[PDB]
Amino acid sequence: NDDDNTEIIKSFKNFILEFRLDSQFIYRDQLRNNILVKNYSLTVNMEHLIGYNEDIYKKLSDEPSDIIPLFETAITQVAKRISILSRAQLLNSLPTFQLILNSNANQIPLRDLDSEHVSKIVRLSGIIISTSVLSSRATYLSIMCRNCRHTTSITINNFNVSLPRSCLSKNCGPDPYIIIHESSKFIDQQFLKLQEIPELVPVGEMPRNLTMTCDRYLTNKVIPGTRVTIVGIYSIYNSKNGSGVAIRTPYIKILGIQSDVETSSVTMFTEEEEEEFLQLSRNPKLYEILTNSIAPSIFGNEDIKKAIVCLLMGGSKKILPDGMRLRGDINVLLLGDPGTAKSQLLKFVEKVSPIAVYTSGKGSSAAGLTASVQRDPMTREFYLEGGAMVLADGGVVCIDEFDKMRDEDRVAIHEAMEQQTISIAKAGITTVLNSRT
Amino acid sequence: DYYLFLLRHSSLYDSFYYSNYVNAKLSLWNENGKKRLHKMFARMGIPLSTAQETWLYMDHSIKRELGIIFDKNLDRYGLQDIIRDGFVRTLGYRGSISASEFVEALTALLEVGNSAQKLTNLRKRWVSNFWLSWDALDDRKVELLNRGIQLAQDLQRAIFNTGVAILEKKLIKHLRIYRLCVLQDGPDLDLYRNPLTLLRLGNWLIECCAESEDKQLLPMVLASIDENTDTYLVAGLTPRYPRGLDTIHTKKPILNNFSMAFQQITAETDAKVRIDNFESSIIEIRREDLSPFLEKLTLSGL
Amino acid sequence: EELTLESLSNVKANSYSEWITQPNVSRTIARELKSFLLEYTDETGRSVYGARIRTLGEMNSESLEVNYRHLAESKAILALFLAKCPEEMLKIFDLVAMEATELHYPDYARIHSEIHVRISDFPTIYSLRELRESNLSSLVRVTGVVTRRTGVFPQLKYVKFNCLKCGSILGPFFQDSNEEIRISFCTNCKSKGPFRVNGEKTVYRNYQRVTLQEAPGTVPPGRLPRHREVILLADLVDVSKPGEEVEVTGIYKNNYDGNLNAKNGFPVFATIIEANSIKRREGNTANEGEEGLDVFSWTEEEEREFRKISRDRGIIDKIISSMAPSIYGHRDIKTAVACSLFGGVPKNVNGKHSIRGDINVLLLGDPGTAKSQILKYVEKTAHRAVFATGQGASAVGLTASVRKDPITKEWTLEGGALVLADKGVCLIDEFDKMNDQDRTSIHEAMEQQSISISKAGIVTTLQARCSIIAAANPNGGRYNSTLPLAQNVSLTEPILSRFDILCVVRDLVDEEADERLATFVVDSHVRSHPENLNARQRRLQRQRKKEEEISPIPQELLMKYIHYARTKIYPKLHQMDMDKVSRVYADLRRESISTGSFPITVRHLESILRIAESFAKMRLSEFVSSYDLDRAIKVVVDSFVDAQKVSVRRQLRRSFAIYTLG
DNA sequence: AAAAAAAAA
């Protein structure tokens, strides 16, 4: 049993230490540059793994949840080999390294997932709708007995353990153990909700939601309302607290995330795109090359496109030592005859902007835009839930059929757009909330 | 290896779909061809969802037993001429490339990359494309080959989309001596200003025509439009025997008399043509001058 | 072993359930069933099940549909055995179906290991009120509506256990989807102890359970509905949708319950229905033309007939004349309805521009013009139809609505009327009287083809691809021919411009027209009188004879043709005159508001293109020809010119005659 | 117990 684990670890270590293209060992230099900046992680591409040897990829695709931890401990073994000196014999504050994967396999829609995808590596795309608060998880537990009163340590992996029966060798109880919270190691976990993309929904149906779990460095990376591409494991976890017989609610374990925005919005750009942007800014007719690029499928409108460009760039925010604020956005209203292509510009403006939301003024309400005061049925406590004008903070909000909007609903936006802050007082909750859009 | 379009770089479904020989043998331009293809896939036993995945992530067991699957299944449909022997080159951990795939990538990179004045600009663009293709040869560059492969896929898609429309419209007029078809109007016709692209389209058309029950071997004339210059680009095409034929009826390859016909017509009549291409069977003719010329070619001894 | 069919007539055991499983008779049943589905001949003399198996192999689906009356006319005893003991017969019939499928496709097991069978139409139909103790463990056919759908979760199919007191691995065990496996002595060691699942070697199914109420159209008036629970196994997941009336054939079974016994104080048992076949029955109540789970599905021979009859000259005229064969006149209305229910082609430019591909139609005219009958026929023939009327529909009822789930207690989305109209037609009657707040909520549905909701902390956009057909009445109850359309109705330009084809019907006085209409109505009334081999097929030929006298083609063939044309054929638009259409649009921009009141915008050019594409679709052609464009432009010009005052109608008619010469 | 959406007066 242990021989196979050692063989697999040796295979992965040989892959890490022997893979080279031309005159560079890419993964060793990656480990060096990661350790220097304190990012204990490594990224593996599927194509390299398949090209090196096919048996390792076959074993990884067969039973992923059992094989991945062996790779993630081989990584830290190699890191300790190539980062510290034996010195003929310390801190050693190197936890188990995180493994991140990338792939280019065929995508699978959410509704296509079924019983044959259990315990398999799948790639899929969706939209993030809500992010849970981070919670703690135990990795290295220091455990103390009560009667014999000795010390023991438990190492816990996150993939796929209870109090040991009897004591370690007089006549203790079944489980006479307690948890020593000090001298224990903890990590972070987060929950996310994913929704099907609108264009892939089947005929006459409604979007379906799914639950994902991320941990360590993968947490706090996405924000609600951003299209993402996820690679992970589709497994099932039972619900003892929670219909039917032998039921098992499925979920996703996140291994890798790709996003279009790349979490750019301080500067995360490298030198090549920076100099490309500077050279583009040196174009002496950039104004026209941008005006022509705003919906090239719409003919005739030019001042509208110039106004849209000016709105997209946005003003310059200003503050004063006296404490007063000055607005830094411009608001454009289109008020004209039918057939002049007003909504087709609204959807394109929604598409171009990095953060944007498109909603109708008819199917909307005052409480459904700024902040809705929901109440958790379980713990029976009040909490604020974001609407639509808080999701579009730092971006642009697309409203059409503005006149069809109710008079009582149309008044809540006054302060929200003239001061860029919303104040709420409901059920004892007194919170001023910022919304700049 | 097999007569397949980028087997190791595209899915097996697309490989069967875009293959010229498979198209000719199964008539994929109408719905019965797709029904026969689905019957083929079901009888072989590869799932439709499995066959639509990349060759890298395609199932290892099926990739291993593909040879036996093909050997046992292709006989009924009569595609047993698709299997042949080819050369494969591997360098380290990069991957595997076949000679056919590499030459298709090179051809497509030549095709796409990057009055008299516009013709000169087109010719200098062509020589620049040649230099870029030449640079792509060395082993130190692979982003100049992946791009070529994806451009080959795109160009084959465009050629298929135009050929299906041609076969729908039945533009192939059957004259007494030689078949004729003219691409008067349509989409993406600017791509066909390249003689090599026109030859690719003509090769697919002549394969489709040969893979029929007709017992007439007639030369085919294909023409296009370049609205900026208002000139027709006319290329003569030789007939081809079916690939699954013995050597006894191969006493001499089919010759091409189009160059002789064009030169004789131009030397006996003051037509406004420009015969300068190294291929003597490709000429540029005027829109107003095409027809009279055509009747002349009909009346002249070919 | 006398494996003869006649020996199955008399039972030797006490019950069917313990007799069928006998080894001697089970193989006889298997071989007889094989001889049945390998040799059954239809009216044409060909094995229909062979074509069914071929199509199943093409589509690599899970369900093979076997018709009940086919098994009833020949080999009735097997049908009776299936009707009385379904669970014990479906297993053998699945085995023989798998053998038959592998006969055509060797090594098909790699695609799928097991095959599931479906029963098409049982003879007897019950309701939810009429359920007793006698019909337990037997096939039932129940019609109802879907109220709450739980979702999709996996289940264990082949359960195995590892007992660690003796190191004993239990064999593969089955699960009945409502009972837990319970083992007492734990195999040879004959002792009970700790055990584990060890699920590394197991197979999974997926289920879905739903609540079934009574249809309001069959409940006694003023009473309360009855609820049951329906369990859906694999290949039946997500087939049913909330709010959709369905008919389910299944098996009736009972199980113990503790709280139910506690509350009633008597040994009462709960009852559930496990589905075996589902048939949607929304809108299309006409269910007598043909049998089967679906009436919009075609065989290979029907596709061949479609292709054979789609090439004849003047098929457009036959299609138009074969629609509503019991309504006299109104050729323009029939043409508009055909062009609206055939639809166009949605366009996506570079994934960044969207062009709608469905046609809206507005009807207007005097009373007694049979607009509602046309609407009823449209609802009958369409695949997905939703009927709304007058003030009985609200703004939030047509679009999506937000609702707080009473169980989990959070806001959720409820599908509206327009959502059910995706890939279909939404029909509205008495469009004029509907209140403006109830009328302004479908602008996006007409034009943007999308519904956006930002309510109660939910920000979602819902796609809607629906065609709207509306009927209304002018001011005063009659159309004043000497007034423009702006003074005839209270609707405004934003709503009027979204309708492609607008028809105005006038009721005038004509002697010979009145005589002809009276003759046609009287002959129709006489025709539909309830009083004028197998008797059923004789009734069928009588119906065919009665039908062929008013319609060029049968109705079921027309419905399957419409479905096929909407599904597969996509016309393309290359060789059309640029200048003719551009000049016609310029001419229509001229006159119009510059001389009258009817609004014309860029939407009507796209409407002309969509009508041309629809006419191309009607011929099962992939490319638009010139004749289709001529027909479309003629229709649009006629519809525009025939809605003006009587002072300028002749002048405009002779002014526009140069575009539709023909 | 308190917030927010829907049909009818």
Ligand SMILES: Nc1ncnc2c1ncn2[C@@H]1O[C@H](COP(=O)(O)OP(=O)(O)OP(=O)(O)O)[C@@H](O)[C@H]1O
């Ligand atoms: N200038 C234009 N160029 C091209 N297409 C146009 C132009 N103006 C309008 N259209 C066409 O008009 C059609 C409908 O436009 P749309 O519904 O967006 O109009 P609108 O002015 O926003 O209407 P509403 O005021 O009723 O909301 C689109 O298909 C679009 O292509």
Ligand SMILES: Nc1ncnc2c1ncn2[C@@H]1O[C@H](COP(=O)(O)OP(=O)(O)OP(=O)(O)O)[C@@H](O)[C@H]1O
């Ligand atoms: N050619 C015909 N034109 C008009 N009505 C016809 C014709 N032939 C028969 N009818 C009869 O005319 C009657 C008209 O029905 P109905 O009252 O529903 O029409 P309507 O005036 O369009 O209705 P609504 O009040 O909904 O506007 C029907 O009973 C129908 O049988």
Ligand SMILES: [Mg+2]
């Ligand atoms: Mg609009």
Ligand SMILES: [Zn+2]
């Ligand atoms: Zn102890």
Ligand SMILES: [Zn+2]
């Ligand atoms: Zn035992």
